[PDB]
Structures are given as structure tokens and as C-alpha cells.
Amino acid sequence: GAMAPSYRVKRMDIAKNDEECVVNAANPRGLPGDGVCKAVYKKWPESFKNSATPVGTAKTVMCGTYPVIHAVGPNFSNYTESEGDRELAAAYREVAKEVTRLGVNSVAIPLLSTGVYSGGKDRLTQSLNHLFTAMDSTDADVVIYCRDKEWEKKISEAIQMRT
Ligand SMILES: [Cl-]
Ligand SMILES: [Cl-]
Ligand SMILES: [Cl-]
């Protein structure tokens, strides 16, 4: 684990991360998809061999020796608010188990279910709080990746508030 486990946020493409492993915001079928998923497919295509996994779960596939943790958050257009919230919390819990199993000292993670799976809603706080709930008991350095300037500021404020 990291000597002083921390959270940081960066506004840039997660495919250029400087961490020991990456979390993909995957679809259940292991398809190239859009957004973060498509960038992950371009950078680590080999990690999509047998990466299909149900909603609410995470499945790790190696690209060489670099781990890609495919985490499947719910599409809020299909799920009710309550069941979608439960699946979103479950996907992050499975990410924490995989990061721990891998023994990595750092992990790059996007906010699950905040893009095309958001159902047209702003889910920054909902997704980030589930990320904290799952990752707080791990000792890896967590680096959250985002693309919007306003979201970078809000995620940074949420991280600083707890320190
Ligand atoms: Cl970039
Ligand atoms: Cl999404
Ligand atoms: Cl964003």
C-alpha cells in the first residue's frame, strides 16, 4: 500500500494515467463503447478479451502486466433510482476488492454512471460518495480522472473537505 494513502483529481484522459492500474467505466458486454470506455479500448484493446461482466460487478483483465479493472455501473435510463443506486454502490465495492487483490499502490478511476449512463442527471456527488465509501478502507493512492473544468473543481473541494 501507499505510505500515506491519498485521493487526488486530474482533468485529462484516463488513458494517459500515471497509476499502476486503471478502472474502465465498462458496458456489460465488453464492447468498445463510448467516452472513457472507447479511450480504454484504444489504449489497452487486449484487456477486452472476455471482459463482459454483469451490471454491479468488476472484472480485471491484464494488458501485458498492466491491470484493467472493467467496472460496470448501471445505466440510470434503465434502472429505477433505488436499484440503480444499489448497483452503482456494488460496482465500486467490487473495484475496491480488485484493487486490494492486485496489491497495487495506486489506481486511476473515473466516476461511474456520470456520462451516458447518468440518465440525463448530474450524478457527481452520488458517484463520488460511493467511490469514497468503497475506497476509504483501501490503502492505494486513488487518482480520479474527469474531463469537465467545473467537475474538477467540485471533486477537488470534496476531497479537501475531508482532510
Ligand atoms: Cl488529455
Ligand atoms: Cl457513464
Ligand atoms: Cl467529467
Side-chain angles (χ1 to χ4, degrees), residues 56-58 85-100 112 130-131 133-135 138:
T57 72
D85 190 67
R86 192 191 68 72
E87 294 286 13
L88 181 55
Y92 279 116
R93 289 196 306 273
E94 301 297 308
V95 168
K97 295 174 188 185
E98 285 294 283
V99 164
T100 300
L112 301 177
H130 286 310
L131 188 160
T133 297
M135 305 301 295
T138 74

Coordinates of all heavy atoms in Angstrom, one line a residue, residues 56-58 85-100 112 130-131 133-135 138:
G56 N -23.1 -3.9 -11.9 CA -22.8 -4.0 -10.5 C -21.6 -4.8 -10.1 O -21.3 -5.1 -8.9
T57 N -20.8 -5.3 -11.1 CA -19.6 -6.1 -10.9 C -18.4 -5.4 -11.5 O -18.5 -4.5 -12.3 CB -19.8 -7.5 -11.4 OG1 -19.8 -7.5 -12.9 CG2 -21.1 -8.2 -10.9
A58 N -17.2 -6.0 -11.2 CA -15.9 -5.6 -11.8 C -15.1 -6.8 -12.2 O -15.2 -7.8 -11.5 CB -15.1 -4.7 -10.8
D85 N -29.0 3.0 -7.7 CA -28.1 3.4 -6.6 C -27.4 2.2 -6.0 O -26.1 2.2 -5.7 CB -28.8 4.2 -5.5 CG -27.8 4.8 -4.6 OD1 -27.0 5.7 -5.0 OD2 -27.8 4.3 -3.4
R86 N -28.1 1.1 -5.8 CA -27.6 -0.2 -5.2 C -26.5 -0.7 -6.1 O -25.5 -1.2 -5.7 CB -28.7 -1.2 -5.0 CG -28.3 -2.4 -4.1 CD -29.4 -3.5 -4.2 NE -29.4 -4.2 -5.5 CZ -28.5 -5.0 -6.0 NH1 -27.4 -5.2 -5.3 NH2 -28.6 -5.5 -7.2
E87 N -26.8 -0.8 -7.5 CA -25.9 -1.3 -8.4 C -24.6 -0.5 -8.5 O -23.5 -1.0 -8.7 CB -26.5 -1.4 -9.8 CG -27.6 -2.4 -9.9 CD -27.3 -3.9 -9.9 OE1 -26.1 -4.2 -9.6 OE2 -28.2 -4.7 -10.2
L88 N -24.7 0.8 -8.4 CA -23.6 1.7 -8.5 C -22.7 1.5 -7.3 O -21.5 1.4 -7.4 CB -24.1 3.2 -8.6 CG -23.0 4.3 -8.7 CD1 -22.1 4.0 -9.9 CD2 -23.7 5.7 -8.8
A89 N -23.3 1.4 -6.1 CA -22.5 1.2 -4.9 C -21.8 -0.2 -5.0 O -20.6 -0.3 -4.6 CB -23.4 1.2 -3.7
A90 N -22.5 -1.2 -5.5 CA -21.9 -2.5 -5.7 C -20.7 -2.6 -6.6 O -19.7 -3.2 -6.3 CB -23.0 -3.6 -6.1
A91 N -20.8 -1.8 -7.8 CA -19.7 -1.8 -8.7 C -18.4 -1.3 -8.0 O -17.4 -1.8 -8.1 CB -20.1 -1.0 -9.9
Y92 N -18.6 -0.1 -7.2 CA -17.4 0.4 -6.6 C -16.9 -0.5 -5.5 O -15.7 -0.6 -5.3 CB -17.8 1.8 -5.9 CG -17.7 2.9 -6.9 CD1 -18.9 3.6 -7.2 CD2 -16.5 3.3 -7.5 CE1 -18.8 4.8 -8.0 CE2 -16.5 4.5 -8.3 CZ -17.6 5.2 -8.5 OH -17.6 6.3 -9.3
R93 N -17.8 -1.3 -4.8 CA -17.3 -2.2 -3.8 C -16.4 -3.3 -4.5 O -15.4 -3.7 -3.9 CB -18.4 -2.9 -3.0 CG -19.1 -1.9 -2.0 CD -20.0 -2.7 -1.0 NE -20.9 -3.6 -1.6 CZ -22.2 -3.2 -2.0 NH1 -22.5 -2.0 -1.9 NH2 -23.0 -4.1 -2.5
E94 N -16.8 -3.8 -5.7 CA -16.1 -4.8 -6.4 C -14.7 -4.2 -6.9 O -13.7 -4.9 -6.9 CB -16.9 -5.4 -7.6 CG -18.1 -6.1 -7.0 CD -17.9 -7.2 -6.1 OE1 -17.1 -8.1 -6.5 OE2 -18.4 -7.3 -5.0
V95 N -14.7 -2.9 -7.2 CA -13.4 -2.2 -7.6 C -12.4 -2.3 -6.4 O -11.3 -2.6 -6.6 CB -13.6 -0.8 -8.1 CG1 -12.3 0.0 -8.2 CG2 -14.4 -0.8 -9.4
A96 N -12.9 -1.9 -5.2 CA -12.1 -2.0 -4.0 C -11.5 -3.4 -3.8 O -10.3 -3.5 -3.4 CB -12.8 -1.5 -2.8
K97 N -12.3 -4.4 -3.9 CA -11.8 -5.8 -3.7 C -10.7 -6.1 -4.8 O -9.7 -6.6 -4.4 CB -13.0 -6.8 -3.9 CG -14.1 -6.7 -2.9 CD -15.3 -7.6 -3.2 CE -16.4 -7.4 -2.3 NZ -17.5 -8.3 -2.5
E98 N -10.9 -5.7 -6.0 CA -9.9 -6.0 -7.1 C -8.6 -5.2 -6.9 O -7.5 -5.8 -7.0 CB -10.5 -5.7 -8.5 CG -11.5 -6.8 -8.9 CD -10.8 -8.1 -9.1 OE1 -10.1 -8.3 -10.1 OE2 -10.8 -9.0 -8.2
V99 N -8.7 -3.9 -6.5 CA -7.5 -3.1 -6.2 C -6.7 -3.8 -5.1 O -5.5 -3.9 -5.1 CB -8.0 -1.7 -5.9 CG1 -6.8 -0.9 -5.2 CG2 -8.5 -1.0 -7.1
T100 N -7.5 -4.3 -4.1 CA -6.8 -4.9 -2.9 C -6.1 -6.2 -3.3 O -4.9 -6.5 -3.0 CB -7.8 -5.1 -1.8 OG1 -8.3 -3.9 -1.4 CG2 -7.2 -5.9 -0.6
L112 N -18.1 6.5 -12.2 CA -19.0 5.6 -12.8 C -20.4 6.2 -12.9 O -20.9 6.9 -12.0 CB -19.1 4.2 -12.1 CG -17.8 3.5 -11.9 CD1 -17.9 2.2 -11.1 CD2 -17.2 3.1 -13.3
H130 N -20.1 7.2 -3.4 CA -20.0 5.7 -3.5 C -18.5 5.3 -3.7 O -18.1 4.2 -3.2 CB -20.8 5.1 -4.6 CG -22.3 5.1 -4.3 ND1 -22.8 4.7 -3.0 CD2 -23.4 5.5 -5.0 CE1 -24.1 4.9 -3.0 NE2 -24.5 5.3 -4.2
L131 N -17.7 6.1 -4.4 CA -16.3 5.8 -4.7 C -15.6 5.9 -3.3 O -14.9 5.0 -2.9 CB -15.7 6.9 -5.6 CG -14.3 6.6 -6.1 CD1 -14.1 7.4 -7.5 CD2 -13.2 7.1 -5.1
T133 N -16.9 5.6 -0.3 CA -17.4 4.6 0.6 C -16.7 3.3 0.4 O -16.3 2.6 1.4 CB -18.9 4.4 0.5 OG1 -19.6 5.6 1.0 CG2 -19.4 3.2 1.4
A134 N -16.4 3.0 -0.9 CA -15.7 1.7 -1.2 C -14.2 1.8 -1.0 O -13.6 0.9 -0.5 CB -16.0 1.3 -2.7
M135 N -13.6 2.9 -1.4 CA -12.1 3.0 -1.4 C -11.5 3.4 -0.1 O -10.3 3.3 0.1 CB -11.6 3.9 -2.6 CG -12.1 3.5 -4.0 SD -11.6 1.8 -4.4 CE -9.9 1.9 -4.5
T138 N -9.3 1.0 1.6 CA -8.1 0.5 0.9 C -6.9 1.4 1.2 O -7.1 2.6 1.6 CB -8.3 0.4 -0.6 OG1 -8.3 1.7 -1.2 CG2 -9.6 -0.4 -1.0

